[PDB]
Amino acid sequence: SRLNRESVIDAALELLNETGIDGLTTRKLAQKLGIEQPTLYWHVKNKRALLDALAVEILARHHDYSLPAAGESWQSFLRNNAMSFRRALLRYRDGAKVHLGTRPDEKQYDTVETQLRFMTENGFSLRDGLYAISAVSHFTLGAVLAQQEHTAALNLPPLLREALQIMDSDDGEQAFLHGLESLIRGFEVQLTALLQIV
Amino acid sequence: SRLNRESVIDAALELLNETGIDGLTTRKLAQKLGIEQPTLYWHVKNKRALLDALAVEILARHHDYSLPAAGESWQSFLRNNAMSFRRALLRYRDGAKVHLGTRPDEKQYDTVETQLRFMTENGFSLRDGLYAISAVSHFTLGAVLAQQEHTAALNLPPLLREALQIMDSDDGEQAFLHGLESLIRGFEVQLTALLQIV
Numbered sequence: 283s284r285l286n287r288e289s290v291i292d293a294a295l296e297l298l299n300e301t302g303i304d305g306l307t308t309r310k311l312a313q314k315l316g317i318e319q320p321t322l323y324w325h326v327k328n329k330r331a332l333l334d335a336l337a338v339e340i341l342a343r344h345h346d347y348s349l350p351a352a353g354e355s356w357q358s359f360l361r362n363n364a365m366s367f368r369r370a371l372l373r374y375r376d377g378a379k380v381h382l383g384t385r386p387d388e389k390q391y392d393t394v395e396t397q398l399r400f401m402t403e404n405g406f407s408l409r410d411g412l413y414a415i416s417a418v419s420h421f422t423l424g425a426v427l428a429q430q431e432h433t434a435a436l437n438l439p440p441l442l443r444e445a446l447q448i449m450d451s452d453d454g455e456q457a458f459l460h461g462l463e464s465l466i467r468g469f470e471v472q473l474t475a476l477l478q479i480v
Numbered sequence: 481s482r483l484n485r486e487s488v489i490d491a492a493l494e495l496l497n498e499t500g501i502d503g504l505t506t507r508k509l510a511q512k513l514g515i516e517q518p519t520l521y522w523h524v525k526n527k528r529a530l531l532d533a534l535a536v537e538i539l540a541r542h543h544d545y546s547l548p549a550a551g552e553s554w555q556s557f558l559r560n561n562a563m564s565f566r567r568a569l570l571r572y573r574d575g576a577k578v579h580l581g582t583r584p585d586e587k588q589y590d591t592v593e594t595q596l597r598f599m600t601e602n603g604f605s606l607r608d609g610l611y612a613i614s615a616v617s618h619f620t621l622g623a624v625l626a627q628q629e630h631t632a633a634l635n636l637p638p639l640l641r642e643a644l645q646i647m648d649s650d651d652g653e654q655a656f657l658h659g660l661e662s663l664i665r666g667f668e669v670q671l672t673a674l675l676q677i678v
């Protein structure tokens with residue numbers, strides 16, 4: 283079938299949904315594409331290359347809140363951004379595993395530079411803004427991975443029994459959203475402290 | 481060589497360090513143990529079973545701050561606990577990947593019940609205590625995975641160039657510790673608010 287970049291990526295994401303990340307292979311992608319392996323190789327050199335591009339394309343396609351709205355507070359941007367990042371990661375099977383270990387791609391440079399600049403224009407040092415952004419990313423990544431990998435892997439004392447009912451009660455959104463608010467407020471307390479002991 | 485549980489686990493962890501998690505296999509474990517595969521099978525049924533037990537044993541062996549000290553504040557316990565969890569996850573290659581998707585084991589029940597009880601004795605509802613504990617776990621998991629998987633996978637606008645120097649500057653401990661403080665303070669602001677609008 284068609285082997286332009288967009289079509290290869292479409293097929294790969296469809297396969298990711300079928301197999302998950304551990305089970306995704308270039309051999310299986312070739313089969314899905316109706317092509318022989320040396321044909322695939324011309325287009326896609328190895329699994330790493332493919333995973334690198336899926337991480338980028340999952341966000342380009344589905345991570346819609348990458349930029350602050352005009353006038354938006356930094357707290358609100360981080361909140362919407364995290365929510366959007368989470369949704370994009372959850373969209374495909376093992377999506378968070380796909381993102382892990384990537385670094386920003388050149389096609390994301392201007393976006394991510396805008397995010398870092400925006401934090402600094404709101405009073406953060408570059409370093410502190412980066413810490414806040416990285417904490418949001420790590421927290422969101424952790425939460426999504428816990429959920430998705432929990433699913434992959436698939437006598438109690440009373441408080442643990444209950445905690446597990448609680449967790450078995452929703453998809454992880456409630457705990458994520460509550461933690462996110464805590465994270466943001468801690469950042470704010472830090473920012474507003476300046477050089478005061480806090 | 482010896483195939484009691486402790487010896488199998490020792491050998492598996494040594495192998496994990498050599499191969500990482502994706503490359504860890506029961507065939508390679510058998511080779512390391514000097515035994516044939518059907519011999520290994522008697523002891524270890526599959527990879528999942530082995531990963532499940534490594535997650536438990538990495539914490540039993542190296543996660544030393546699982547319990548509050550007498551008199552310790554909840555904020556301090558979460559801090560020490562997170563630090564200890566991080567260190568244990570970083571101890572083996574792909575350690576955080578090994579933990580992901582596990583649930584508490586019966587051998588951890590009494591420990592984890594004590595943690596949940598401790599949060600409730602400090603004013604948290606079970607639900608809110610669990611959210612705090614899960615946020616710490618997810619944040620710490622995210623941070624460790626970002627680091628370890630970054631390593632596995634191994635023109636810039638100026639703020640991104642600098643951010644990447646910053647990140648290339650330490651192992652991830654500084655950003656983790658700073659984020660952790662933010663997370664804890666947000667939890668505290670929440671706890672102390674009671675029913676006030678905050």
Ligand SMILES: CN(C)[C@@H]1C(O)=C(C(N)=O)C(=O)[C@@]2(O)C(O)=C3C(=O)c4c(O)cccc4[C@@](C)(O)[C@H]3C[C@@H]12
Pocket residue numbers: 341345347348363364367384385386390393394397398415416418419643644647
């Ligand atoms: C916080 N939010 C989830 C950010 C985001 O929305 C992104 C986006 N493309 O819109 C990311 O790329 C974003 O999700 C993301 O992945 C980011 C990163 O990986 C990094 C890394 O690894 C190193 C330095 C800088 C960044 C970063 C500033 O680009 C990160 C921004 C992340």
Ligand SMILES: CN(C)[C@@H]1C(O)=C(C(N)=O)C(=O)[C@@]2(O)C(O)=C3C(=O)c4c(O)cccc4[C@@](C)(O)[C@H]3C[C@@H]12
Pocket residue numbers: 445446449539543545546561562565582583584588591592595596613614616617
């Ligand atoms: C926060 N800190 C890192 C905790 C910890 O120190 C643990 C330990 N064994 O000492 C965990 O098991 C701990 O790390 C950990 O893994 C915990 C969990 O996985 C869960 C899950 O998945 C579901 C319900 C309850 C828990 C939990 C209360 O046992 C978690 C406690 C985690």
Ligand SMILES: [Cl-]
Pocket residue numbers: 283284
């Ligand atoms: Cl076609």
Ligand SMILES: [Cl-]
Pocket residue numbers: 283284285286
């Ligand atoms: Cl073509």
Ligand SMILES: [Cl-]
Pocket residue numbers: 286287288289
């Ligand atoms: Cl194209």
Ligand SMILES: [Cl-]
Pocket residue numbers: 306307308309328329
């Ligand atoms: Cl492959």
Ligand SMILES: [Cl-]
Pocket residue numbers: 307309310
């Ligand atoms: Cl295959």
Ligand SMILES: [Cl-]
Pocket residue numbers: 381382383384625626
């Ligand atoms: Cl990452």
Ligand SMILES: [Cl-]
Pocket residue numbers: 481482
């Ligand atoms: Cl022996």
Ligand SMILES: [Cl-]
Pocket residue numbers: 481482483484
């Ligand atoms: Cl034996």
Ligand SMILES: [Cl-]
Pocket residue numbers: 484485486487
């Ligand atoms: Cl033993």
Ligand SMILES: [Cl-]
Pocket residue numbers: 504505506507526527
């Ligand atoms: Cl295997």
Ligand SMILES: [Cl-]
Pocket residue numbers: 505507508
């Ligand atoms: Cl093998």
Ligand SMILES: [Cl-]
Pocket residue numbers: 427428579580581582
């Ligand atoms: Cl997990």
Ligand SMILES: [Mg+2]
Pocket residue numbers: 381384385386419
């Ligand atoms: Mg990233």
Ligand SMILES: [Mg+2]
Pocket residue numbers: 579582583584617
């Ligand atoms: Mg766990």
